[PDB]
Each structure stands twice: as structure tokens, then as C-alpha cells.
Amino acid sequence: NTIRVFLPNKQRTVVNVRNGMSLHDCLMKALKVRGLQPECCAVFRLLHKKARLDWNTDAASLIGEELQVDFL
Amino acid sequence: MTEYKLVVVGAGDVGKSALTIQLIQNHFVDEYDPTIEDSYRKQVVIDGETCLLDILDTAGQEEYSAMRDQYMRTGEGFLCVFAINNTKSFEDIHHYREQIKRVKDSEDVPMVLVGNKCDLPSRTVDTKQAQDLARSYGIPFIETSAKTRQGVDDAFYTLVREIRKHK
Ligand SMILES: Nc1nc2c(ncn2[C@@H]2O[C@H](COP(=O)(O)OP(=O)(O)NP(=O)(O)O)[C@@H](O)[C@H]2O)c(=O)[nH]1
Ligand SMILES: [Mg+2]
């Protein structure tokens, strides 16, 4: 149960989704470690025209998706 | 700005991601959190040159060795990491080195052998085994601890220096 996330500055991560975490909570560590914070970024679901997402979207609802996080 | 593609490889649980996060953020992740794939970029000064490190932290769990081999092939230099309390991860170094040589289709690739978790008690992989193994490949061996940060910059900077002399 993971989500592939493309990150600013040509970085990327795959995160494990534990039960009951929002996207904010789910990506906090991967962003913190790279000197970013969710506050000044937007997150998008990439389709199969990307869809902008609220950071409070539940991470378990995006299992198997690909996301982009980008500076605002 | 000069860019160096570094790849951190080794068996699961040896400390590949903890070492990388110490280089990037000077912070020690005491968590268990296995990697699928993580890439990092950080700007550093080495031997008086500003350069960009692009660090691919691979999955030790070889069930994800598809994503691993896909991004290795662009790497210019490899950290081959084992943990001093895991003999299997030490014997596995041979496997990861032959994988690097296969994915690079070359005998000549910059590499550094890293023995991590040197802070732990009851070490089982002794210093002379490790130095002997590094010697057998003609590569530097660096003892590290991501917990205390010992050896962390030395491991990555040595790699960059090995990449520069390979031109
Ligand atoms: N005492 C000590 N613990 C360490 C050290 N390095 C890593 N650890 C711990 O060992 C465990 C595994 O570390 P981690 O970096 O996740 O390993 P990995 O090689 O990235 N694993 P994977 O390949 O699955 O992603 C974690 O609990 C981590 O905190 C170290 O130098 N000393
Ligand atoms: Mg890891």
C-alpha cells in the first residue's frame, strides 16, 4: 500500500500509507528530510490535466496512484 | 554546476537511507521504514568545489530490484553498504558489485565499501574482514555510523573524489 510521489528539485519518493493518515501526514517526513514543507507546495494526482488535491485528502484513498508535489 | 549521480546499494536494513538522511539533513532516523525508492539532491562543497549530489537511495528488499536496476544504470559512483552486525549483508557485497558491473556493462566503476552501525555492541564483521574485502576490489573501505554521524561525509565525499579521478 504505497504511493509514488514526484517531488520538487527533481526528487522522488515512494511512501507507505499507514491507516488513517492524511496526505500532509503521509508526506511530512519525505518533505522535512528534503527541506520542504507542505505549506508552500501544492500536490496533484496524475491521471491515466492532473487534479490538484487538498493536503487533507486521506492517503489511503490514493493507494496505487502517482502524485506530483510542486512549489506554489 | 557539476552534478554527481551517486547510488546507495546494499541489503535491506543496513542503513542506506539513514546514512543518506544524515548526509542530507544531519538528522538520525531511528525508525524502521523500508525504502521502495527515494532520490535526493543536495548542494555541497568538496575539495573547494560547489557541486550537486544526486543520490539514489535504493531498496535493499530485492523484490523491488526492478526499480533499482532501472535507475542504477545512470549512476556515476556507488556506495556499497553492509552492516557490521549482519554477515549476510557483508557476503552480499559481492552480489551488489557484480550487479553494478552488469548494469554498467563495465569493469571500471567508482565504488566505496561502507561498513555501517559501528556504534552497535557485539560487532560480528571484524575490521580486517572488511578491509580485506575492500582490498580485494581495490576500493576504499569506510566505517560509518549514521547514529553518531561518524564517517558519513567521508563515505560520500570519497565517492565523489573517486568519480572525479575516473573523469
Ligand atoms: N544503531 C544504529 N542503527 C542504525 C544505523 N543505521 C541505521 N540504523 C537503524 O537500522 C534500521 C535500518 O536502517 P535503514 O536506513 O532504514 O536501512 P536501509 O538499508 O535503508 N533499509 P532498506 O533497504 O529496506 O530501505 C533502522 O531502524 C535505522 O534507524 C546506525 O549507524 N546505527
Ligand atoms: Mg532505506
Numbering used by the authors:
A (entry chain B): 56 to 103, 108 to 131
B (entry chain A): 1 to 167
Paper text:
RAS proteins are small GTPases, cycling between the GTP-bound form (active) and the GDP-bound form (inactive). RAS proteins are the central node in signaling pathways controlling cell proliferation, survival, and differentiation through interactions with various effectors, such as RAF, PI3K, and others. KRAS, one of the three RAS isoforms (KRAS, HRAS, NRAS), is the most frequently mutated RAS protein in cancer patients, and G12, G13, and Q61 are three hot spots among the oncogenic mutations.
High-resolution crystal structures of active KRASG13D and KRASG13D-RAF1 RBD complex provide snapshots of the State 1 and 2 conformations, respectively. The electron density associated with GMPPNP, magnesium, and switch regions was unambiguous in the high-resolution maps. Since wild-type and mutant KRAS in complex with effectors adopts the conformational State 2 in all crystal structures determined to date, presumably by both conformational selection and induced fit, the structure of an intermediate state could likely shed light into these interactions, with potential relevance for drug design. A structural comparison of GMPPNP-bound KRASWT in the State 2 conformation with KRASG13D in the GDP-bound conformation and GMPPNP-bound State 1 and 2 conformations shows four different snapshots of the Switch I region. Sidechain atoms of T35 and Y32 transition in opposite directions in these snapshots, illustrating how the conformation ensembles of the Switch I region change from inactive to active (State 1) and then from State 1 to State 2 conformations. The conformation of the T35 side chain is maintained in the State 2 conformation of WT and G13D mutant of KRAS; however, the Y32 side chain occupies a different rotameric conformation due to a steric clash with D13 in the KRASG13D structure. The difference in Switch II is likely due to different crystal packing interactions and is not believed to be associated with the G13D mutation, different states of Switch I, or the presence of RAF1-RBD. In the most stable double mutant KRASG13D,A130I, we found that the slight population shift (~10%) induced by a second mutation A130I resulted in a two-fold increase in the binding affinity to RAF1-RBD compared with the single mutant KRASG13D.
